[PDB]
Amino acid sequence: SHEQFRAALQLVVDPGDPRSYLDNFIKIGEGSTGIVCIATVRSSGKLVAVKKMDLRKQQRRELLFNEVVIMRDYQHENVVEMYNSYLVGDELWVVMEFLEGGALTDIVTHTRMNEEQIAAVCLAVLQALSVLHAQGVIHRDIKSDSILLTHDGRVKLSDFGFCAQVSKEVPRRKSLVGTPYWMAPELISRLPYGPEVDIWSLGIMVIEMVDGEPPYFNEPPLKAMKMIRDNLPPRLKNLHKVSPSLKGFLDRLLVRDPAQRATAAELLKHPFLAKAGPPASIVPLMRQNR
C-alpha cells in the first residue's frame, strides 16, 4: 500500500535522483507536507530549493499528485517555478525555484508594512489567483506562509499541495482543507465551495499584514473555526491604522456569502491596488535589510 503508492508516483515523476547533481542540502523550512532545503547545483554553483515529502507522513497521500499537476500545467510570473520531481526512497522531492527572500510570514511577524507594500503584495497575489481561478484551480491554503519573495522583492505563490480543480463536471469542492485561522466560513460549514475561498483567505492575510496575526490566533484551532463559522466577519484590531481605500478593499474580501464576495478578476480593478509600489518597495522589509 505504501509500496503501491510509491510505484504509482514513480510513473509520474522524472527518472533518477537529483543527489547526482546537487550538493550541500541545508534545511530552511517546514510545512505540513514536509521540509524545504536549499541545495547547490554542482555544475553552476547556482542555488535551488528542494521540497521533500515523506509518503508515510501525509494525511491524504493522493494530494501529493498536486505537486505534479501544477508543475506540468500551471506556470506564471507570480507562481514559484517547479523544475523536476523525483521519487527518492520513501519521499517525493520537487526541485524548484529558490525564493531567497523567504516567506511573507517573517515580514508580518517582525515589521509593519505600509499600504504601498500591502497593495504590492495583494496585486501580485491577485494576478496569480485570477489566472489560476480562470482555469479552475483553487489554491486552498492562502496565508503569509505560502507567499515567497525574491531578493529584489518579487512576490510569488507557493505550496500548492492542497489545491484542487473545479470544472463544469465538478463545479464545487467539498473537502475540509487549509489552515484553520484562514479557512473560509462556507468551507468550515462544509458547504460545497469554489475559488471564492481563496479570496476570503487573502482577506485574512491582509489582516496578517496589518495586525501581524490572523483573527482568533490565540484561540485553539477548533474554537477559532467555530467562531469564523458563526460570527460576523472578523475585524481589524487596528481599524484606525488603515486607509478608507484599504478598508473598502478588505470589505470585498471578507464577505460571508461567497456569491457576494469579489472575484480576483474584479479585485484587480479595485482602486486600493493603485497604491501598489514596485517590487523594490518590498526589499527593505526582508530580514537581511531591516
Binding site: 505540513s32 491554503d141 484553520p180 490565540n218 485553539p220
Partner: peptide
C-alpha cells in the same frame, strides 16, 4: 493556540 499548522 497560535497554530501555523495546516489540515
Amino acid at each position: 493556540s497560535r497554530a501555523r499548522y495546516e489540515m
